[PDB]
Design an enzyme around this catalytic site. Sequence first.
Site, PDB file in Angstrom:
ATOM      1  N   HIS A 143      30.125  -1.826  26.367  1.00 11.44           N
ATOM      2  CA  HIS A 143      30.490  -0.817  25.358  1.00 11.44           C
ATOM      3  C   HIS A 143      31.223   0.369  25.981  1.00 11.44           C
ATOM      4  CE1 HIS A 143      26.358   1.166  26.205  1.00 11.44           C
ATOM      5  NE2 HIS A 143      27.252   2.089  26.513  1.00 11.44           N
ATOM      6  N   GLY A 152      24.334   9.522  28.826  1.00  4.03           N
ATOM      7  CA  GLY A 152      25.006   9.385  30.109  1.00  4.03           C
ATOM      8  C   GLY A 152      24.348   8.401  31.053  1.00  4.03           C
ATOM      9  N   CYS A 210      23.587   5.110  30.483  1.00  5.97           N
ATOM     10  CA  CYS A 210      23.952   3.691  30.383  1.00  5.97           C
ATOM     11  C   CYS A 210      24.453   3.196  31.737  1.00  5.97           C
ATOM     12  CB  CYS A 210      24.956   3.470  29.268  1.00  5.97           C
ATOM     13  SG  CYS A 210      24.361   3.993  27.696  1.00  5.97           S
TER      14      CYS A 210
HETATM   15  O1  LIG Z   1      24.231   7.419  26.684  1.00 13.61           O
HETATM   16  C1  LIG Z   1      23.594   7.077  25.698  1.00 13.61           C
HETATM   17  C2  LIG Z   1      22.075   7.175  25.681  1.00 13.61           C
HETATM   18  C3  LIG Z   1      21.299   6.252  26.378  1.00 13.61           C
HETATM   19  N1  LIG Z   1      19.954   6.282  26.445  1.00 13.61           N
HETATM   20  C4  LIG Z   1      19.334   7.272  25.811  1.00 13.61           C
HETATM   21  C5  LIG Z   1      19.986   8.264  25.038  1.00 13.61           C
HETATM   22  C6  LIG Z   1      19.301   9.260  24.302  1.00 13.61           C
HETATM   23  C7  LIG Z   1      19.973  10.145  23.507  1.00 13.61           C
HETATM   24  C8  LIG Z   1      21.359  10.085  23.413  1.00 13.61           C
HETATM   25  C9  LIG Z   1      22.067   9.149  24.113  1.00 13.61           C
HETATM   26  C10 LIG Z   1      21.415   8.210  24.953  1.00 13.61           C
HETATM   27  N2  LIG Z   1      24.207   6.609  24.590  1.00 13.61           N
HETATM   28  C11 LIG Z   1      25.667   6.436  24.508  1.00 13.61           C
HETATM   29  C12 LIG Z   1      26.045   5.041  24.036  1.00 13.61           C
HETATM   30  C13 LIG Z   1      25.322   4.662  22.742  1.00 13.61           C
HETATM   31  C14 LIG Z   1      23.813   4.872  22.906  1.00 13.61           C
HETATM   32  C15 LIG Z   1      23.495   6.291  23.350  1.00 13.61           C
HETATM   33  O2  LIG Z   1      25.824   5.502  21.675  1.00 13.61           O
HETATM   34  C16 LIG Z   1      26.341   4.717  20.583  1.00 13.61           C
HETATM   35  C17 LIG Z   1      26.239   3.289  21.024  1.00 13.61           C
HETATM   36  C18 LIG Z   1      26.579   2.107  20.407  1.00 13.61           C
HETATM   37  C19 LIG Z   1      26.341   0.894  21.040  1.00 13.61           C
HETATM   38  C20 LIG Z   1      25.761   0.904  22.296  1.00 13.61           C
HETATM   39 CL1  LIG Z   1      25.382  -0.609  23.067  1.00 13.61          CL
HETATM   40  C21 LIG Z   1      25.429   2.070  22.940  1.00 13.61           C
HETATM   41  C22 LIG Z   1      25.663   3.278  22.291  1.00 13.61           C
END
Ligand SMILES: O=C(c1cncc2ccccc12)N1CCC2(CC1)OCc1ccc(Cl)cc12
EC number: 3.4.19.12
Lengths: 301, 301
Positions: free
Chosen positions: B41, B143, B145
């Site tokens: 993604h 951030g 991922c």
């Molecule tokens: O970076 C994060 C994220 C990851 N983990 C915990 C978090 C907690 C709060 C806010 C962000 C995070 N994204 C960015 C990418 C993400 C998930 C959140 O947005 C939309 C989307 C669609 C499909 C996928 Cl497959 C991943 C994302």
Amino acid sequence: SGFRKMAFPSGKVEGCMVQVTCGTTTLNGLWLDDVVYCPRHVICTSEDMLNPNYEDLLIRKSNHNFLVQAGNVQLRVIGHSMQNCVLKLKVDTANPKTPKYKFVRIQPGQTFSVLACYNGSPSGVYQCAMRPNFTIKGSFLNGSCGSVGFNIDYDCVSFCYMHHMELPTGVHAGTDLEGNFYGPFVDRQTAQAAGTDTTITVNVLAWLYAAVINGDRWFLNRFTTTLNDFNLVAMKYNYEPLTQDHVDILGPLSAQTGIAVLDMCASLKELLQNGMNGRTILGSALLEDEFTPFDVVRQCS
Amino acid sequence: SGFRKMAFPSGKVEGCMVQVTCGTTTLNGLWLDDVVYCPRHVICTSEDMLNPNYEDLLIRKSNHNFLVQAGNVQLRVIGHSMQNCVLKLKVDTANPKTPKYKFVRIQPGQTFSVLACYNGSPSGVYQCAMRPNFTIKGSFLNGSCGSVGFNIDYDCVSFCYMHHMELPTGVHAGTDLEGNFYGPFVDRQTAQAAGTDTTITVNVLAWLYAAVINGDRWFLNRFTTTLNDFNLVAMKYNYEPLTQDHVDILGPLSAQTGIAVLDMCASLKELLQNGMNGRTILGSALLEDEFTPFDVVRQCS
Ligand SMILES: O=C(c1cncc2ccccc12)N1CCC2(CC1)OCc1ccc(Cl)cc12
Ligand SMILES: O=C(c1cncc2ccccc12)N1CCC2(CC1)OCc1ccc(Cl)cc12
């Protein structure tokens, strides 16, 4: 989102760990520049443990009596010195993996990451706190002496703990890296025990803020309190007093959440008096006190 | 003595972490030999999130559209490929710090260490478990991922998780390193939610053994039970069934403690029915299920 007992990455410290042998005693050492630091009781035998004179025990020792092993590469010991309860072994080779480092002593209530090691080999890492009674609730088996506790500030490793012994309650005691014990403990065989411990109040408050930041708000109330009245209740529950400097330190967290510090003190008072009624906070059924205000800001922001 | 949520040392993995940018999206990557692995993604925009066709989105992408940064040293991308939900970016330089590694997929109930990273920079390490519902209760902010979960076997890093997203309950979902999601989750914007979770029974039993090994024996009883009768009570408490293979796995721990596995199942049944009566086990007021039998043997022996 989420809240975990999070340690610092340990790579910078893993590269400093070595094995130190003297006699039949093997333990861990910390190799920075051309010096290896380790617990001085490495030079002791079962005989000299009730009344060791380390000045005498070390004068009868020679450099070739110390075998230092960085993995398989043996490091040549060209000098030995005692600094309080640590032994400093000058080696012929400066550690090429020496990070920018500092030796700092921490305060009760402060946290640090522990790299548990055996035979100079890193086994695991975990977060710990210096308890009010100057002990730590660590996880250590025979062979772990010389394992270090540390915090990372930017690219600088601030070493704050070296492990020396286990007390009868199963808790642990050690020194700063200048060889000075935390708490009233000595590196000799005695009936030494940890004194009575208290709860680190400002940390419980920091953790309640972490909970709110994570959407756990069930324990919140509209009531507020005075620092004095709060402290009057906390001490009945074996909690350390809260100071103005503690509320000032919790200011960022109060602003980010919109919950005044004394509002959160009011919620704590009620939790202390009523318990949680079968509920949990951040996955816990008791009040957690091993996260500092900094730990929360670091993990939640 | 002691029992802590202990992670693996993270050095071997820290040296593999890089930053990956495509468009205005920056996330983390894993650099092994001359390949960088990251969530696919990374190639998406807010527009293509409700119905992304990653085959189409990636064909419209060129190699120079990917900026890989190992610290400050930029790595030249000479090739791109998609493997399920991961993107593989072939780089001109083999990572000199590549450890002996393996890509393994784990089972619900198994644990692993997480190196949370931001902009390719390691921030912290913590122990996690794959829940029965294929989610993990991690600690992650925007951030993160591309952060990886892993276990260390000898000198071999067995990578088992790459982080992709956060679900509405605040829990996390991701893939193995071959790009296959854990659980019924997709890398597209949907109302996906974690299903109902259960407790990992064999782990609670392992943790009770850890407690006994540490001198906490208050919950022990002289009674015993049958696997069937135990399982009949456990399911009422949302616990996973215990199998013969689970009791066989708990055999070392039973021998070391002299407490039969079904004896310890009897104690668990009583704890489930009566609670702990204001007591704690290994510092916890609830039953911990994120330590495997191996985790206990590793920390207690
Ligand atoms: O970076 C994060 C994220 C990851 N983990 C915990 C978090 C907690 C709060 C806010 C962000 C995070 N994204 C960015 C990418 C993400 C998930 C959140 O947005 C939309 C989307 C669609 C499909 C996928 Cl497959 C991943 C994302
Ligand atoms: O290696 C350990 C040890 C360390 N921590 C936890 C443990 C749990 C169980 C068993 C051993 C350990 N020693 C060896 C050195 C030690 C403490 C235990 O013995 C006698 C002694 C006298 C003075 C000192 Cl200053 C240290 C020791």
